């Protein structure tokens, strides 16, 4: 009596699938450890990744659904849901967490306010949660500035990720008080085996260091990459080398 | 008996206008001094700018026609013409010059060979002429590498310009033996009045210096911008502050 069809690239299927998941809270929290380059047994925080566990049992990665949530203008609904779930699960432990915010939320000032209202409701978790924005969807300088101020006021921290293409604006970061900067994986990929990549990394680390901004390398896959990242003095690392995204533990 | 019409955005007019200019050698050489940031009375070279002097007497800037030469696939014809004219006018003096090469020329291996043939014909000017490529139209790493090798072999030098967005590849420049790197004007614009721009410039200068690659700032307009560029240790400057593009002298 129960049939299933392949959803593929069908906008109808996706629309139905996602509106339902949003309404029914079908999204679950996955985590990846973010860890000190100098001593990988030392955990900085756990990055929270969104997982859709559909009715047929399969888990769907944020990389897969986020573009559809965008297309339908629901990314703000996702953040509201993700943020409330994360603030709830943090009651159970003492670890620090990082969670993305999309531009849809930052642009829409009502949504953005709702976020702050929620945060204000859990000022006791402030020190344990960092919000991240991917370089792809940075708002304007003045929005960055107001966002960081409000968060610092509420007791929470802010960070950027997938950083690198916009090194231009490194100077513009000097007063934001970011917790850290996550460097896109492409700039460290196979860097033990591609030394020409090092000079850029050396430049970012030195400039970021002069403004007190720790660097954390993304998507580290290899003991080789890790050894270079560590050698060159970066603060943190994350990636498949420390495991796949998994549920809490 | 002689009438003229406005050429505007008319592809027909432009096609006719440019094919004629190319065939009849209607392009003239303009120059801008490129000068030491530490001592602006000290001239590094003169950048050669292409000017179309049409029949109605008006002069048309490369910025205006190059996009049409592209559209029609004639940019290689322009380089051949520009390069031969430049090598001819250098016989008259002892100044150093810099001249662009387009991607159309670098891609087409026959054209590229013609260039080398011409260069080989004037090996006596090698030390006085630098070829430049804008960051917009950099070829692949291996083409850059072969191009620089052949030029160094012929006795000529090579440089990149409008550099900045691709700081990623700074490491990839370490063995090219570029004569210098020209920094896009946007990174120094009003930099005495926009200090957040300095940290990026500091990063480029330090990384470029570690690989022996002098930095030269483009499109400097202001005594203020100049004073910062000089303070921060960059090698060279060019722009409207030292005059408009004019014919030889
Ligand atoms: N090739 C490679 N890939 C690796 C490696 N390590 C982790 N990854 C993958 O790349 C992403 C890493 O997490 P992210 O940087 O936070 O990047 C995140 C994050 O920016 C975003 N995202 C995830 N959850 C949320 C969310 O709840 N809200 C918002 N607005 N965005 C989210 O989308 C990305 C997540 O996509 P995911 O499908 O979860 O894909 C994950 C993860 O599975 C590695 O060593 N190599
Ligand atoms: N806002 C501002 N602008 C300034 C300033 N100083 C100079 N400029 C302008 O910007 C360009 C500077 O020369 P360029 O960097 O070599 O940049 C050149 C060069 O890359 C290219 N080009 C010029 N001649 C040739 C040529 O013979 N062959 C090729 N392939 N390209 C050429 O197109 C550009 C020239 O366009 P132009 O129309 O000649 O425009 C010139 C010039 O008039 C300044 O202080 N402020």
PDB file of C-alpha atoms in Angstrom, chain B residues 19 27 72 83 85 94 111 190 194:
ATOM      1  CA  UNK B  19      39.093  46.330 -39.584  1.00  0.00           C
ATOM      2  CA  UNK B  27      46.682  52.937 -33.976  1.00  0.00           C
ATOM      3  CA  UNK B  72      35.436  40.188 -33.568  1.00  0.00           C
ATOM      4  CA  UNK B  83      54.393  45.064 -30.779  1.00  0.00           C
ATOM      5  CA  UNK B  85      55.293  49.589 -33.723  1.00  0.00           C
ATOM      6  CA  UNK B  94      66.942  54.523 -24.348  1.00  0.00           C
ATOM      7  CA  UNK B 111      50.245  33.846 -33.038  1.00  0.00           C
ATOM      8  CA  UNK B 190      41.745  56.425  -1.113  1.00  0.00           C
ATOM      9  CA  UNK B 194      40.387  53.992   4.311  1.00  0.00           C
TER      10      UNK B 194
END
